[PDB]
Design a protein around this nucleic acid. Structure first.
Ligand SMILES: Cc1cn([C@H]2C[C@H](O)[C@@H](COP(=O)(O)OP(=O)(O)OP(=O)(O)O)O2)c(=O)[nH]c1=O
Ligand SMILES: [Mg+2]
Lengths: 218, 1005, 419
DNA sequence: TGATTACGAATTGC
DNA sequence: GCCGAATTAAGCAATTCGTAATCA
């Protein structure tokens, strides 16, 4: 655990050693977009922008990636609803419970599973306006995603339209699975079997599969 | 409505999907028509009667013939017929996408189906009927039955159009600008409305000027506005705040123009304006549909194009706008990249390449000269274009090296007269072009005052007008109309797709006319196959005239002659031994007679085989030949219109269009040889190449050693058809119309695919041209047959061969005489290569000329020429190393960026990625960049060069060589001296010199 | 993302599990799937394979040569027969140890293999032993079943099964040559056995033990022996007349044996085997011109240059013997199998297989021998390049070229008759 | 410590 | 309340350069 100081809010970034060779550049890319970004109320609160930088990267295998936080009530760690209200987490829990067979559940978190890192491409969002901070985050998002992809083996992208050109935004090749968002109309996520494909690919690359029922909370 | 002429077709992507047509009437009124847009499927009667939810609409397409185009190998003359069926077919239209298991014709798009089934041309003039049209808004109607609305066609008429060309200039202190720190300084607009009025105006930011400076600017003639409502476009210079500037930009960009043309505006200009507008104010640029039911915000999006070669890989990127109002946002940068081939694609380079003229000196003295340009100096048209561009130009480049500032300019009735601040030059005719400016923008922004502001305003207005000049130079409107007519595509989609997409409209029309569907059953397997034949040159230096003879559209004509299509292949017969091969040949010669069936021998498909014969039918015309005939007709039309052109611009445009149609015709064959295509046919491509090789060998054998004596011409062999016997005369003696006293002999030296070089033992060019024309007429009349013709290209003097594809010569065209200037032609040499150098080219040119002069004079005592050339080269390179007077621009190479590499280590991609990581401006996936070799300044001369790719450095527009850095001359010197050595004849002294200087062994041809 | 992709990935993983025990078709499918997966997902943990060297040492250990100690658990003993070794997988072709190639097998054997694979899917691979056209089961393994019932239904199918033995031990016993001899006598099999493999119930690994001694024996002469329709096995005798067994004639060439010399040999209680691993043209011509001019090679076998005849054709047509050309159309319509076989199969290969010629040498002789034909029949021939004739086998094949052309004309003008 | 060969990449000509 | 929209790819032949792999 190391710390760095920046000019604007939250004035401090605490990071794990695995994120060492990016932090400096991040600072230089954050001091030029913070003033405009902090003119608006954002989800999440500024203090919870960089709480996924505390997690280690040397023991991760799969990354599940969105495009922006929840429009309202964001917690900082992607894809978490502590009261189990948001639609996306409910639907991902339903699909994974159908796969694994567990029937009695009251919540599901992707940050408890071992070897899985959840990520948001854009780290901030105005209240009620999806993809309203893309220009501020572009460089930071590209840099941090590229750093993540040097450690994981499979990258799972949620959103067909948003991640259409993900191969152009990355330099080194990596296994990529692009599917539908959980909250997509025309019910496309129900007929999605991406988790089994992820497990098959991992076991194809001499890697342990993922205990996808570990994230349930009782 | 009544008479309408179409401008654009565009789609809407809301909850309900529609198709829009934008058109104009004779008076100048704009009319929008809205159609429902469906998904189109083609099914049979048995499938149609068994669709559980009945389709929205179905139309009877009649009886159609379905053919299986798979290719199988046969070991004996028992060949099964092709699977052919005949059935009633239906074309069903669905509001939403449906999956049908056994649907056919699934490679064509929805817009093509709309056009072809409704009988509508994307670029036609029509006389609509209001019986089928209902008014839904002021200037917007709705059509439900497009088949009857567009039933009547009328002759084409001319309409007015509206244009906007814009440029921006932004402040920067140390590097490329950033939207979060650096503001916008200038915005320049050129504006053409429907009344033909041309207006030019520049807006200057006043937030970076002192109050006294604003007051003196207003006193000098400028206008100051504090609100959007108090701007007049009739004033050239207007100064305002940044917010008002962005609001004016937003108002201008929201209008319903026809073309908004910019140079690299989708990546820089429009993006910067949008982002700065959203930062300073919360506003957005909103586009509305013609029916006022869909509103969108401007947001540039990226299209990435991947390669079809190995490991796929991304290879190009393009940026587009997302408007839904009918306006076409055109970027000249992408168009010029996809159109022409240059070293650099910056605006200065394109201006230098396009706008050049020859000027005559009228005055000298002081620090200036006066040049004149007229139709008596360069050509008919170049002076006019130069005078057109000089109305706003500021700097002129003389002799490709000197940069000069314009003092006075006069536009005469015919040409131009310019005065430039240039040193004294001792000649009479010089070259002028529009290129770089020797100014330091960062330094000017560092100390900003009124004079610098006005100068930057002039530069920006010139940058805005260059867009219009290039728009007229490249003929984008004519090309757009031609492409929309031929390809059956909307006006906004012509310059976006490759050959596999632009040949689908004509293909669909042809299939519907012939009533044919082509299907595949099993997978496609790819094997290598051989290509054209290239002859080895017989000697290097000639000193005799060489006559060039060239076929016309060789591969399409081969396809037409043999009727080579995937559906006309009777079969392929193979054999693994001589016994079965002989039996098969004896039976095959009589089961399939020659006049109707054509049999082609080919190199075997697999290692264990010793024969392969492919049979093709000629009773019913194939599908590929008809496409080729269409494209050939278009090329002939545009060549004919080129022949009648007078001005230079029209000649250039028509030449480009005929070249485009030629390339498309060749692309059809290439697709026939492409695995992932719907027209894949291994046998057809193999046969096309085989017939081409046969034809080149026939022509070369007939021409090699041919004698013209008395009035008769004796060929080398019998003029016999190399495929089958025919009714032509095969006499090798023909009667000519040339004078009796002539006596000449003809020998063959070189050839590539559809070309033969014939040496004539003479030196004059008039007699040579006469004999060439007579010989061409005789060859066409008596030697060739069917649809094969040749052409007499030119006469080559002082021809020098180096390798099989590298030669330099002096060209006399067919319509030329002795008292005419030749044209220097280089093919494959180290002067057209884009990756060699600039120093290398100058040295090689001067030494080639010196060598030719020395051989003309001639001493060559023992090895005098070699000793002299090597000594001169040694002196020149030593002087260059010691003096270091040559700039960095003479040591710069070019390369294109992409991500299509086997293995990801790849020093090139790492270099570009590191540059992008450490620099503000980014190199994209289809961009060309400069690089050089740089080494520390303290190193001495290096003998053994160990790691060369570690010294590559990228040279940007703001690169200054450090005081501890130097150009790594050894690589350039090594390449130059290798090329010099490969030309001479001695070996021992050359090897000794090379080993003494670089410690390596030269390679020889 | 879809289910078809999921099943493609599962099939790819399954193929990747079993690669050493594979054939050409499986390799082609695996490479196609690897290319598709790399194209779709931009990166896959497996890469394309081109060599694919089959190996068996994964399931076997080093051969023992000294007495050892055994005691716990029940033991299963399986003898090792003599002959070539073949590997069989689930729905795959024939592969040879080290020199895996498509080897022809009887149709009944293929049908039995197909039915035994369809009976149960719990079979990894099968090891087959061949000894002069005597196909014998050698080894069978399974992670779920036991090597008792599998041999039971293999026996009931109709294919012979080795007499595997089951033994039990309570006390610390010493296994030596005496116990090996006792087991061999208990086997009561006259076939040559090399080693005994002892396995335990539950353990997948199999361990073999073999006993032998070194000796030097002289060579007197060479003689060939018949066992079937024009197929030969060589044999060399010594001064004492002892019988020696060898793997194949290729073993003779690789041993570089010379006339009237002495060579090393591994001798056992019952029989002995010559040891290999002691140019090629010299030996390949010396062996034949020592045994006799009337000899030529068919892979691992030797053959005459006999005159042959219509019986030599009708025997393999599975038709009643006859000598009247007119009647040669009657019995063809009597059996559907014969007519189907002759329609599907070609003419040149028919005469080639009737005369038992080799494939490569015959073809390389024909491809440099010009022919003159008329009405689909051969009427004249000549040689142009005699380089291949430097091979004595090519000359031996050329010897009966007249009978070849005669049977060729017979085949062509009878197939014309019967359409 | 050298000679020599094989492969990929960039470019131009048909 | 909390996305997604159907699709958009010519061939081979020859030369020149650097770097990695293999051979005495
Ligand atoms: C230029 C070019 C040629 N080719 C092939 C097909 C041509 O028949 C052959 C000869 O090239 P060209 O002589 O350049 O083309 P052409 O046959 O159309 O001749 P012309 O312009 O005089 O009518 O090379 C391609 O496949 N692609 C190309 O881009
Ligand atoms: Mg030509």
């Amino acid at each position: 655990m190391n710390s760095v100081t920046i000019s604007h809010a939250p004035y401090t970034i605490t990071y794990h050693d695995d994120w060492e060779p990016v932090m400096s550049q991040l600072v230089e890319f954050y001091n030029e977009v913070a003033s405009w970004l902090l003119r608006d109320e954002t989800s999440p609160i500024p203090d919870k922008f960089f709480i996924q930088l505390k997690q280690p990267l040397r023991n991760k295998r799969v990354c599940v990636c969105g495009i922006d936080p929840y429009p309202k009530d964001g917690t900082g760690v992607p894809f978490e609803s502590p009261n189990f209200t948001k639609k996306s987490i409910k639907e991902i829990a339903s699909s994974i419970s159908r796969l694994t067979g567990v029937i009695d559940y009251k919540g599901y978190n992707l940050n408890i599973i071992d070897g899985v890192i959840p990520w948001n491409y854009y780290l901030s969002c105005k209240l009620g306006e999806t993809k309203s901070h893309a220009i501020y985050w572009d460089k930071i998002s590209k840099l941090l995603l590229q750093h993540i992809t040097k450690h994981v083996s499979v990258l799972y992208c949620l959103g067909k339209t948003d991640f259409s050109n993900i191969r152009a935004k990355l330099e080194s090749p990596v296994t990529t699975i692009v599917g539908y968002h959980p909250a997509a109309r025309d019910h496309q996520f129900e007929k999605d079997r991406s988790f089994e494909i992820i497990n098959v690919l991992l076991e194809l690359d001499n890697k342990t599969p993922i205990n996808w029922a570990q994230g349930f909370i009782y | 409505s009544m008479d309408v002429r179409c401008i654009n077709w565009f789609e809407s992507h809301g909850e309900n999907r529609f198709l829009y047509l934008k058109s104009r009437c004779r008076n100048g009124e704009t009319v929008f028509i809205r159609f429902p847009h469906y998904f189109y499927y083609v099914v049979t009667d048995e499938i149609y009667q068994s669709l559980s939810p009945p389709p929205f609409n179905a139309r009877p397409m009649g009886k159609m013939r379905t053919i299986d185009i798979d290719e199988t190998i046969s070991y004996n003359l028992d060949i099964k017929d092709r699977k052919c069926s005949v059935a009633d077919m239906w074309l069903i239209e669905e509001p939403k996408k449906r999956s049908i298991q056994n649907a056919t014709m699934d490679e064509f798009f929805n817009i093509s189906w709309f056009y072809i089934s409704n009988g509508i041309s994307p670029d036609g003039c029509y006389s609509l009927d209001e019986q089928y049209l209902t008014k839904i808004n002021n200037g917007c109607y709705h059509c439900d039955d497009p088949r009857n609305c567009f039933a009547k066609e009328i002759p084409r008429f001319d309409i007015p159009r509206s244009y906007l060309f814009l440029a921006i200039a932004c402040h920067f202190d140390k590097k490329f600008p950033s939207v979060f720190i650096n503001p916008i300084s200038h915005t320049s607009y050129c504006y053409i409305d429907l009344s033909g009025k041309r207006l030019l105006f520049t807006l200057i930011n006043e937030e970076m000027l002192t109050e006294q400076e604003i007051q003196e600017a207003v006193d000098r003639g400028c206008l100051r506005i504090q609100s959007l409502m108090e701007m007049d476009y009739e004033r050239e210079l207007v100064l305002c705040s940044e917010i008002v500037l962005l609001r004016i930009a937003k108002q201008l960009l929201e209008l319903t123009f026809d073309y908004v043309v910019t140079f690299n505006g989708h990546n820089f200009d429009l993006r910067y304006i949008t982002n700065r507008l959203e930062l300073l104010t919360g506003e957005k640029i909103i586009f509305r549909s013609p029916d006022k039911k869909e509103a969108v915000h401007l947001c540039i999006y990226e299209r990435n194009q991947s390669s079809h070669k190995g490991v796929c890989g991304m290879a190009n990127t393009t940026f587009h706008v997302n408007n839904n109002n009918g306006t076409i946002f055109f970027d000249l940068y992408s168009f010029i990249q996809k159109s022409e081939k240059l070293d650099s694609y910056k605006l200065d380079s394109i201006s230098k390449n396009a706008f050049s003229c020859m000027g005559k000196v009228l005055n000298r003295g002081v620090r200036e000269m006066t040049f004149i340009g007229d139709d008596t100096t360069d050509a008919k048209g170049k002076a006019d274009t130069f005078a057109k561009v000089l109305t706003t130009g500021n700097y002129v480049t003389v002799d490709e090296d000197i940069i000069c500032k314009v003092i006075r300019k006069d536009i005469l009735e015919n040409g131009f007269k310019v005065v430039l601040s240039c040193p004294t030059l001792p000649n009479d005719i010089y070259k002028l072009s529009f290129g770089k400016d020797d100014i330091d923008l960062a330094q000017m922004y560092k100390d900003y005052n009124l004079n610098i502001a006005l100068d930057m305003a002039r530069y920006c207005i010139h940058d805005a007008c260059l867009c219009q000049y290039l728009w007229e130079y490249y003929g984008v409107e004519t090309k757009t109309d031609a492409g929309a007519a031929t390809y059956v595509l909307p006006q906004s989609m012509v310059f976006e797709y490759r050959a596999s997409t632009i040949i689908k409209g004509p293909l669909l029309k042809l299939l519907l006319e012939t009533k044919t569907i082509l299907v595949r059953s099993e997978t496609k397997q790819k094997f290598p196959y051989e290509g054209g034949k290239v002859f080895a040159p017989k000697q290097k230096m000639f000193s005799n005239n060489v006559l060039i003879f060239d076929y016309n559209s060789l591969y399409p004509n081969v396809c037409i002659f043999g009727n080579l299509s995937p559906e006309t292949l009777v079969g392929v017969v193979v054999s693994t031994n001589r016994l079965e091969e002989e039996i098969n040949n004896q039976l095959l010669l009589q089961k399939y007679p020659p006049p109707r069936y054509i049999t082609v021998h080919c190199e075997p498909r697999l290692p264990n085989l010793i024969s392969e014969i492919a049979i093709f039918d000629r009773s019913i015309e194939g599908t590929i030949p008809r496409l080729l005939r269409t494209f050939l007709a278009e090329r002939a039309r545009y060549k004919k219109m080129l022949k009648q052109a007078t001005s230079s611009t029209e000649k250039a445009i028509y030449d480009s269009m005929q070249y485009t149609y030629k390339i498309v015709a060749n692309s059809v064959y290439g697709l026939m040889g492409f695995r992932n295509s719907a027209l894949y046919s291994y046998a057809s491509a193999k046969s096309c190449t085989s017939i081409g090789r046969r034809m080149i060998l026939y022509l070369e054998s007939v021409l090699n050693g041919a004698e013209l004596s008395n009035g008769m011409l004796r060929f080398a062999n019998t003029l016999s058809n190399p495929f089958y016997m025919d009714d032509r005369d095969i006499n090798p003696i023909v009667k000519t119309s040339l004078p009796i006293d002539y006596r000449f002999r003809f020998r063959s030296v070189y050839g590539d695919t559809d070309s033969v070089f014939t040496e004539i033992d003479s030196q004059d060019v008039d007699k040579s041209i006469e004999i060439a024309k007579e010989l061409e007429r005789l060859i066409n009349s008596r030697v060739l047959f069917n649809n094969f013709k040749i052409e007499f290209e030119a006469v080559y003097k002082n021809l020098i061969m180096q390798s099989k594809k590298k030669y330099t010569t002096m060209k006399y065209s067919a319509s030329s005489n002795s008292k005419s200037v030749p044209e220097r032609i280089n093919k494959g040499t180290s002067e057209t290569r884009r990756d060699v150098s600039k120093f290398h080219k100058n040295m090689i040119k001067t030494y080639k000329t010196r060598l030719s002069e020395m051989l003309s004079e001639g001493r060559m005592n023992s090895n005098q020429v070699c000793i002299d050339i090597l000594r001169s080269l040694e002196t020149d390179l030593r002087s260059e190393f010691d003096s270091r007077s040559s700039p960095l621009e003479l040591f710069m190479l070019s390369r294109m960026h992409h991500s299509n590499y086997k293995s990801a280590d790849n020093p090139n991609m790492y270099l570009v990625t590191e540059y992008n990581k450490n620099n503000p401006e980014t190199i994209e996936l289809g961009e060309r960049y400069y690089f050089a070799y740089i080494c520390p300044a303290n190193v001495p001369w290096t003998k053994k060069l160990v790691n060369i790719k570690t010294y590559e450095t990228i040279i940007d527009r703001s690169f200054k060589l450090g005081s501890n850095q130097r150009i790594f001359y050894e690589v350039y010197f090594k390449r130059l001296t290798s090329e010099i050595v490969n030309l001479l004849d001695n070996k021992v002294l050359c090897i000794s010199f090379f080993q003494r200087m670089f410690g390596s062994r030269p390679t020889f041809y | 993302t879809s289910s078809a992709d999921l099943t493609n990935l599962k099939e790819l993983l399954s193929l990747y599990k079993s690669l050493r025990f594979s054939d050409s078709v499986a390799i082609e499918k695996y490479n196609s799937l690897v290319e598709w997966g790399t194209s779709t997902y931009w990166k896959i943990g497996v890469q394309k394979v081109t060599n694919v060297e089959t190996s068996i040492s994964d399931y076997y250990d080093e051969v023992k040569n000294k007495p050892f100690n055994i005691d716990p658990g029940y033991y299963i003993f399986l003898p090792v027969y003599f002959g070539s070794v073949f590997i069989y997988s689930k729905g795959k072709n024939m592969v040879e140890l080290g020199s895996g190639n498509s080897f022809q097998i009887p149709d009944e054997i293929r049908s039995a293999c197909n039915k035994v694979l369809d009976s149960d899917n719990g079979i990894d691979f099968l090891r087959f032993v061949l000894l002069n056209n005597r196909w014998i089961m050698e080894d069978a393994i399974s992670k779920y079943q036991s090597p008792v019932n599998i041999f039971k239904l293999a026996s009931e199918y109709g294919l012979n099964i080795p007499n595997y033995l089951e033994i039990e031990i309570e006390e610390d016993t010493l296994f030596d040559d005496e116990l090996y001899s006792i087991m061999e006598r208990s086997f009561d099999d006259t076939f040559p056995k090399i080693s005994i493999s002892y396995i335990k119930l539950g353990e997948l690994k199999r361990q073999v033990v073999d006993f032998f001694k070194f000796s030097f024996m002289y060579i007197e002469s060479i003689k060939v022996d018949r066992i079937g329709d024009n197929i030969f096995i060589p044999s060399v005798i010594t001064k004492s007349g002892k019988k020696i067994l060898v793997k194949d004639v290729d073993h003779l060439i690789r041993s570089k044996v010379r006339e009237h010399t002495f060579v090393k040999v591994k001798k056992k209680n019952t029989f002995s085997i010559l040891y290999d691993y002691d140019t090629r043209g010299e030996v390949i011509k010396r062996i034949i011109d020592t045994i006799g001019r009337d000899y030529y090679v068919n892979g691992k076998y030797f053959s005459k240059v006999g005159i042959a005849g219509l019986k030599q054709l009708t025997n393999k047509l599975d038709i009643n013997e006859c000598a009247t050309v007119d009647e040669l159309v009657d019995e063809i319509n009597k059996s559907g199998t014969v007519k189907r076989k002759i329609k599907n199969q070609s003419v040149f290969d028919l005469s080639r297989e009737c005369l038992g010629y080799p494939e490569a040498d015959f073809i390389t002789l024909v491809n440099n021998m010009r022919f003159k034909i008329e009405n689909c029949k051969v009427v004249n021939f000549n040689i142009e390049n005699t380089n291949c004739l430097n091979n004595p086998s090519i000359e031996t094949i050329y010897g009966n070229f007249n009978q070849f052309v005669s049977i060729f004309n017979t085949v062509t003008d009878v197939k014309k008759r019967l359409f």
